């Protein structure tokens, strides 16, 4: 099964951080990376000196159950972020979100697939379109049409 995962990070030197994350994703059991997007850059809000977010999308082939994949992405966030040395909501973070899972539609308290807000997040859709231009969502929406009709903030490569 092909799952699409979004990586975002504003920690220390984000290049190294996401590379670390990519590594962790490949080391997930019964899983290997198919494709990774270019790295993109989302600036923070306000004029304040604050680090940019690095964004990417990954295509993961897995034979794990979706909840099982979430166990692992949750684990990697904790092992690799700052939640222990700081806060959950930390000024800086490592985010791994399961955007899509096969053509599956999952509606539960701990897991909602497709990711609830991804169609409104250009830092998720543009990297995804780079690696899967022909993608169709379970409800029939075509990724290419959403990008022609919805308004997204400019998004340059890192
Ligand atoms: Cl959908």
From Swiss-Prot:
Pfam families: HPPK. The keyword Cell inner membrane does not apply. Thermostable. Retains 75% of its activity after heating 30 minutes at 96 degrees Celsius. Its EC number is 2.7.6.3. Pathway: Cofactor biosynthesis; tetrahydrofolate biosynthesis; 2-amino-4-hydroxy-6-hydroxymethyl-7,8-dihydropteridine diphosphate from 7,8-dihydroneopterin triphosphate: step 4/4. One of its GO terms (biological process) is tetrahydrofolate biosynthetic process. It catalyses: 6-hydroxymethyl-7,8-dihydropterin + ATP = (7,8-dihydropterin-6-yl)methyl diphosphate + AMP + H(+). Keywords: ATP-binding, Folate biosynthesis, Kinase, Nucleotide-binding, Transferase. InterPro entries: Hppk (IPR000550), Hppk_sf (IPR035907). Monomer. PANTHER family: 2-AMINO-4-HYDROXY-6-HYDROXYMETHYLDIHYDROPTERIDINE PYROPHOSPHOKINASE. Belongs to the HPPK family. Catalyzes the transfer of pyrophosphate from adenosine triphosphate (ATP) to 6-hydroxymethyl-7,8-dihydropterin, an enzymatic step in folate biosynthesis pathway. This is 2-amino-4-hydroxy-6-hydroxymethyldihydropteridine pyrophosphokinase. The lineage of its organism: Bacteria, Pseudomonadati, Pseudomonadota, Gammaproteobacteria, Enterobacterales.
